[PDB]
């Protein structure tokens, strides 16, 4: 992009913790000029969210806005505006370039879809089912991908932290494993 700036329009009623974690991760790779703004649409955005971050390579402009789906506008003269905090999360993480085979990459993308739709906006029924698939997966591998940390882990953890079911043993170890990492704790503290 000639704009060189990642614009992200997000609704403050449902803060995209998935993107705030990935932002901290992005800054640990590149020189990021991060800025927070409040759109005319929303009034009286919570204090914590306004200063949630506290030349350069990339711009990261987070605009708190009254939108139905979290939107990213990057290099509009070459790229259609991206909708869905899941789709934006994949893009941000993919900037580090941890290339995976076809089976893993698809399974990682599958894990994002689960977290965003089924787990987040689901009954105690579906939540319980998601925990089993995670518990079984985390029983075999250290992460949900197992090679190393992936977007799948970031987004899913972020969704779990932003919602009354019994939590299994492997998920508890994976939760502290995530929370132990610098980008996860920094982002979560500035939300709480």
């Amino acid at each position: 992009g000639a704009l060189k700036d990642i614009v992200i329009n997000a609704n403050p009623a449902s803060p995209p913790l998935s993107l705030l974690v990935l932002h901290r991760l992005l800054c640990e790779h590149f020189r990021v000029l991060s800025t927070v703004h409040t759109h005319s649409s929303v009034k009286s955005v919570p204090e914590n969210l306004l200063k949630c971050f506290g030349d350069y390579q990339l711009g990261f402009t987070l605009i708190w806005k009254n939108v139905p789906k979290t939107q990213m506008k990057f290099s509009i003269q070459t790229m259609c505006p991206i909708e869905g905090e899941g789709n934006i999360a994949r893009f941000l993480f993919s900037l580090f370039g941890q290339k995976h085979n076809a089976v893993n990459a698809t399974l990682i993308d599958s894990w994002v879809d689960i977290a965003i739709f089924q787990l987040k906006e689901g009954s105690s029924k579906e939540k319980a089912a998601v925990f089993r698939s995670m518990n079984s997966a985390l029983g075999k591998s250290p992460w949900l991908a197992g090679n190393e940390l992936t977007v799948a882990d970031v987004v899913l953890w972020s969704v779990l932290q932003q919602i009354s079911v019994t939590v299994p043993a492997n998920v508890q170890r994976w939760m502290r494993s995530c929370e132990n990492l610098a980008p996860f704790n920094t982002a979560l503290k500035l939300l709480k």
Binding site: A2, L3, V7, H37, T38, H39, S40, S41, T61
Partner: protein, 421 residues
């Protein structure tokens, strides 16, 4: 005729009586005030009559209610006759009863109720026809649009002052005639005279001679000229926040005739530096030089590009090329081809053209020679800064132009109360 007392052309109001009478505003005629005997002084907007009944639209400052003169227990036939015979725009004192309507009156602002008339006196008799050239403008300013535009424009001026005054500013009175020029000189003299923060609402002048109203700011800062720029920005933000909170009635009244999406802005006002803007225009396919000034069409485009990305009708363009700005513009200490200047745009049209002023007499004189000015005729201005001149910046906005671009109107004349053809 038994209602002969209840109507007529009442004697010219030369302040004869102080009646125990409460003339309730039309906006206050809601469902809450139903089945009450109220007095109303309004104009007759339109008066349709058929046989036994006469309906009037009683209007008052962009608000109107449906009034009804029915023959029966209240009025006579000659009263209904007189009611329809009242010429258009005549002002009338009306003693009526607010009665709840079975279905909404979509035409009127007071949809919840109608006014069952008991008395009607013409206090001011309008002559029959209506013109379509001073008396022209008088009628034109009664239109719900004009009323809403200029009541909102009054709002801008109030929000402008209340904002600056609360942040510790002092209003000055620039003379504006000298034996007619621009007011910047006087603001800068005030800065040089220990008046830290000054503003002036007054008429400004630009193959024609043009007069318009300008709201001007001049502020002494500590170390960076952004201290002023970020203040001017917040002040324009506070104006927008103010209009969208209080003047929502007036915005919609203009919207109804001139459709326009709500004005959009960011709380920390968006700032693009000149280099960033050129990259956006060149990516958008515009052959432009590094030191060239933004052509009026490019300003229009750049605004659209900003709206496309950030979705804000209000942004700041900073670090302009020094060559294109006036002499008194402080050069950038690092890149001496760039300046510490800025423009602010509403819907992609320039409203403000501010910068840091040169408070050093010598550098101010050098830049005056660079622009080829006879120092003799600006000796007085330069001499002002020789004794304790603090660092300061400023910027001015066209009240009419701001009102126009906020409501998204086309021609400036729409937001000028008394335009001179």
């Amino acid at each position: 005729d038994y209602a002969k007392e209840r109507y007529g052309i009442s004697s010219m109001i030369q302040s004869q009586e102080k009646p125990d009478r409460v003339l309730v505003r039309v906006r206050d005629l809601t469902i809450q005030k139903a089945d009450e005997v109220v007095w109303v002084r309004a104009r007759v907007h339109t008066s349709r009559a058929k046989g036994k009944q006469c309906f009037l639209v009683l209007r008052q400052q962009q608000f109107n209610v449906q009034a009804l003169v029915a023959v029966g227990d209240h009025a006579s036939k000659q009263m209904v006759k007189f009611a329809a015979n009242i010429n258009k725009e005549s002002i009338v004192d009306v003693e009526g009863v607010v009665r709840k309507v079975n279905q909404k009156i979509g035409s009127c602002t007071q949809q919840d109720v109608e006014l069952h008339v008991q008395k009607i006196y013409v206090i001011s008799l309008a002559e029959p026809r209506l013109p379509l050239r001073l008396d022209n403008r008088v009628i034109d300013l009664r239109t719900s649009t004009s009323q809403a535009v200029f009541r909102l424009q009054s709002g801008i001026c109030h929000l402008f002052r209340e904002t600056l005054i609360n942040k510790g500013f002092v209003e000055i009175q620039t003379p504006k005639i000298i034996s007619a020029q621009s007011p910047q000189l006087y603001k800068q003299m005030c800065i040089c005279a220990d008046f830290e923060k000054v503003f002036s609402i007054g008429p400004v002048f630009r193959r024609h001679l043009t007069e318009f109203v300008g709201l001007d700011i001049e502020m002494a800062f500590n170390y960076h000229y952004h201290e002023v720029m970020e203040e001017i920005a917040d002040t324009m933000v506070q104006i927008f926040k103010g209009l969208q909170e209080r003047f929502q009635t007036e915005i919609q009244t203009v919207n109804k005739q001139f459709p326009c999406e709500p004005f959009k802005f960011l709380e920390p006002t968006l700032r693009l530096e000149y280099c960033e803007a050129l990259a956006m225009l060149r990516e958008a396919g515009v052959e432009m030089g590094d030191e060239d000034d933004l052509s009026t069409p490019n300003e229009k485009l750049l605004g659209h590009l900003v709206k496309e990305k950030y979705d804000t009708d209000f942004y700041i363009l900073d670090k302009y090329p020094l060559a294109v700005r006036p002499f008194y513009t402080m050069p950038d200490p690092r890149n001496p081809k760039q300046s510490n200047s800025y423009d602010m745009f509403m819907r992609g049209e320039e409203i403000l053209s501010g910068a840091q002023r040169i408070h050093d007499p010598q550098l101010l004189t050098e830049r005056a020679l660079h622009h080829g000015i006879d120092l003799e005729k600006i000796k007085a201005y330069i001499d002002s800064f020789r004794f304790g001149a603090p660092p300061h910046a400023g910027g001015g906005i066209g009240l009419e132009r701001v009102t126009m671009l906020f409501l998204g109107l086309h021609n400036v004349r729409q937001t000028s109360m008394f335009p001179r053809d």
